[PDB]
């Protein structure tokens, strides 16, 4: 068998309910150990070693945890065959993409959570954990980047997102589809990311204790400029716009961000629209204004890349090239 | 043939670039009487009369355009057999729901735009416009609320949303599906909305000059409390949270919005997740904090309803009731 | 609490296996009183009585089970407050549509199965059944036709189909979407079917021992006419063509079915394509050949309706109208 | 500018009706000279050579057209820089997979069609054609397999399928998603098919003038054995079974097929279910009865692979192997 480490961070997968009938519950009661001691079948597929890193709802996920997850993984690379990260579902797609850009252990890194509490009828957690370990142990999983494994499906960390608020089938790669499917403890990979990841990225967080400050502002009919102005006033390093349609902006927000972009703030145009690319060559002349278009990166995911871009450069043209590559 | 009034507001639908192949276009350029003439086949299904209300990209849509439109429709109600509104696609989903809650005319009101400019190859707007007049002229279209017609589909104002940044098929009713499909100038209707709309709402905008101020804040890992603080300091009537997962909030945003709610700001919890409801009895004790769960309403649609609700009440209790009925 | 009757027919929901992480299983094996006993939370929402009808895999479902089911619900209607039918997943969409047109009880009638064996890890059966009883118990579920409840979603008998071979989220209403979602054992209904069902149909099976023979043939490139020829020669009362695109047929198949239409056989054009309507007034002149367009009814569903159609009439115009109403 | 050969085979893209608004049309009557001419913007991206092969609707596609096409592409290979094939949409997903297996040429082959006839009001053919030539001319499109280019999307020949009967966005790669998206005449490829293709397959058809005979039977409730029986009694080389759920079979059809398989007729189990794999080690024991499992190949595509498999072999288990690799 291969050697698999489970790094826990909390989530519903660790969370406990009032009873079997209710999804009013608390997030993150239990640790790595008895997520295992509730799925004895793991003994048949892996040598499983579990360690607690934090115990939180992913809605409170932050840069500190990302830094410590990355450094951990980059350090214990060669004491294990692969990693599984138990995590809340809410911000799983952010963590996954951050680790997809910062981990250099080319070994399998898989993330997993649960949409149902552990104490509920037909709790997804167990079989989800089974299948993340499978993906982690299978050696075909390596060099594909950081993974999310949910509902018998293996998804790439860059394209994966939470598409539904309550459904066990929420996680999908909405633009380019999944990498593989899991039936009977086996995977059929028919796809791999072309965007560079893990050890082909230039990002180094090994010495960092904080990350550049990047916020997100939302666009809509009659949008206030007040949220954009508070991020500039507080000297934010970057701002991602969750634009309307193809990264378009309400004029008031446009004006403020146009100003911010010529005054030491990096501006990435993303979209509130859940699928498809925020392109160049449309309604907004990015060159004139010094903005960067995010492509298929949603706001949250754009934020992740922008922070990392900003650990290297503050020039928009080079941030655009970075957005064209990872 | 029935009399159809086209109210034009702008959009790509009235767009046009410097080329048929190139994507670079300007919106709100062509006049309504031109739009009509590029679709003479209109001549055989209605007596079309065009009126220009504004000529803008819908990224710049605002409360005044909404109020103008609703007042125009309610006033001219019984001098026409139905209405079409030509509109950009970026915030069509917001206008549509606005009019769904404020039009009293029980004749059909159909909104329509185009993902590709008029000058473009295989332009979508012509047939979109035709189908939208077919919808508006159909007597079965009446009593279904305000409709959006795009890509041979009839969709309800409440559930319709833009799912894709560039695809002609972007508009979908993502939670409950379309009302009907259009083939050969005819509709087979299999669904009507069950929530109260149009003439059954208490919202009366006929004497109203402004709407209560509602802003939207976004949640993500390490989210700043500054955007939300800026809205509270400006004395906002309501705030809509674009939450993570089932309407959850980053801890520092939670704190600012809790505080706002005790000082008589409406706070609605919605979700950045494109599908599914933000429910009560999840992780957040709505009753304690005086919050409202938005249901299947996404943030930009929650704002629409929250502004109108605020014209009747500021009791979160009654606002929740409205969010459960409209 | 309401008296709910469970009518069991088989399926994986009732079909065990050897180990929890091996996807082998035998189907239709456990009895109704075991299923009920395995879910004690039932006792909090309903007084549940089980009756075994059959115990097969749904792949082996047949006209005789369908007639027993309908006659049973029609006799026992007034002894209970709602029915649930445990049933295999493979042809649940066929049976649901059959009962949708023949049950005369307007009390809730809910079907349910399981995509995973009841012994496997994170088995859907127990929660699936609870939600089905929740729906059968909810009075709001009356007058909506026959329902399929799977994955916290209530779907109408007519539009519902299996979209995926293994996924627990397989059942969707792919043309018009769900009626309602379930959360914390409560249902928000936003939709009901417009097409007529249950007691608003003329089908009366109370004294039928058999149904008209209807068979389905597939179309593809270079398709054999042979299968259509074999059904003709055994004297089939009707044939449904799974066509290509919009109900189109390989020439050889067309001409056989055309001959047969002249010799009193009912011919319905449907489509191998999973979503969308087989329409009239495209490439096939149905009037000329005595053919019927199925609309959004896929081949196996189109079959159900043609069988029941044939218990009233043989005229192609009347069958078309039936196809347009039910 | 690159040299692009267009091989026209017909389709709605070469179809036409009496009126822009009326849906009745006839297929494959517009010549390639007139198609090309209807897109003058072609000159700007290629030097295009129009060659008619046949002018049929793809409902009548057969083996002889497939062979004329393969041969013509391998022969004409070194005289051109890429291939575009105008076709009908109804079987495009069959032809695409056949050509994907038999073209030995490494240059790009791109299939294109239209869902609306060229006379239709917002005809998709002219822009679709342009995009086809873009994909064909982009040098990064090389080495990906045979492509289908519809609705601004570049889809691979193995996974692409028609999901809807009338919608312009009907072509999707429903299990593993698309290869790239086209904006503004350029393509960002993020994926490539893993399974083998074009130059890297065993199959040569340079000299074959006939392909083995392979038919498809459909499973459903109370399904008839007569179609299956008809096909063995004609001594068909192979039978594909569109099964219910995970390739399950009605009892009487199971028998007639068990027979066929271990008396020298090959039998692939596929599924009527539009997505997901017909897997081994579920309900049926494939090795015992001598059945091949089709994986994520649907019936029509499994037939393409099985036809071609039988040029090389007849043992079940080497056909199972071709079904794990191609
Ligand atoms: N709030 C939870 C939700 C979940 O895990 O399902 C989390 O993200 O930690
Ligand atoms: N910016 C445009 C985009 C479109 O119409 O497609 C609008 O006004 O929404
Ligand atoms: N073959 C089974 C599958 C299931 O029940 O899920 C049946 O249809 O009975
Ligand atoms: N029946 C036509 C449909 C189309 O081309 O859109 C064909 O496949 O030839």
Residue numbers in the entry:
A (entry chain C), B (entry chain A), C (entry chain D), D (entry chain B): 1 to 326
Copy text verbatim from the article accompanying this structure deposition.
This enzyme has been used for over 40 years in the treatment of leukemias, particularly Acute Lymphoblastic Leukemia (ALL), which is the most prevalent cancer in childhood. To understand the structural implications of the four-amino acid differences between EcA2-K12 and EcA2-4M, we solved their crystal structure in the presence of l-Asp under the same crystallization condition and data collection method.
The structural and comparative analysis of EcA2-4M and EcA2-K12 showed a good correspondence between the positions of nonmatching residues and their electron density maps, with the only exception being the valine at position 27 of EcA2-K12. There was poor correspondence between the electron density map and the spatial position of valine 27, which may be due to the characteristics of the added residue and its location in EcA2-K12. Given its hydrophobicity and constant interaction with a highly solvated region, vital for the opening and closing mechanism of the active site loop, this may lead to greater dynamics compared to alanine 27 of EcA2-4M. Additionally, among the amino acid sequence differences between EcA2-K12 and EcA2-4M, only the amino acid at position 27 is located within the enzyme active site (Val27 in K12 and Ala27 in 4M), more precisely in the N-terminal flexible loop.
